[PDB]
């Protein structure tokens, strides 16, 4: 069985692309995004959590909004309902396809060969690309609704659908290409 909010089934659906596979934790699965459990003793317990839990967990910011997971459960429960409303299929399959495309491919590290702070082209790991994906999803949605009288759930639902899409309107998909602008040049 196992369904999120009881209205969705973990069973069925699929990972979008090779890589970022097995790093993601689907398959089995827990109704309700939330789980208080030990995930930070080893350094790859972080990709045992299902990514809906990692969304609600990292959705609390900044100092003022931290904690209150029960609050972040609600606004994600509304967000998955809205995703369903447009281009209806599976909120999870749209969300999994979003965090596939969300994070950056390559990155600029500072290796100078002694003396200088000089940039150099380095590809990103599969774990960090999932870490950066869910971070960049939220920081678009939070900044989008920070001053506007638009509910955060609306921003999150909108941000996720956009990320799956190639519109580039999103903050996340821009900040992918903003890094890949400089990462091309640092080759």
């Amino acid at each position: 069985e196992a369904k999120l909010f009881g209205r969705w089934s973990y069973d069925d659906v699929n990972v979008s692309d090779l890589s970022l596979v097995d790093y993601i934790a689907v398959k089995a699965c827990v109704f309700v995004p939330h789980t208080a459990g030990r995930y930070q003793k080893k350094r790859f317990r972080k990709a045992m959590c299902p990514i809906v839990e990692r969304l609600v967990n990292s959705m609390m910011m900044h100092g003022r909004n931290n904690g209150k997971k029960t609050l972040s459960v609600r606004i994600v429960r509304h967000a998955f309902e809205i995703i369903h409303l447009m281009t209806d299929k599976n909120p999870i399959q749209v969300f999994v396809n979003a965090v596939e495309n969300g994070g950056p491919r390559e990155d600029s590290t500072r290796i100078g060969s002694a003396g200088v702070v000089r940039r150099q082209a380095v590809d990103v790991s599969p774990l960090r690309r999932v870490n950066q994906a869910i971070y960049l999803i939220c920081t678009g949605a939070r900044l989008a609704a920070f001053r506007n009288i638009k509910t955060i759930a609306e921003c999150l639902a909108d941000e996720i659908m956009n990320c799956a899409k190639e519109s580039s309107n999103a903050y996340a998909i821009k900040k992918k290409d903003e890094i890949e602008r400089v990462a091309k040049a640092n080759r």
Partner: peptide
């Protein structure tokens, strides 16, 4: 109603 209800975000079809 999309869902039976909520007290903050309404969301109808």
């Amino acid at each position: 109603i999309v869902g039976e209800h909520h007290h903050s975000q309404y969301i109808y079809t």
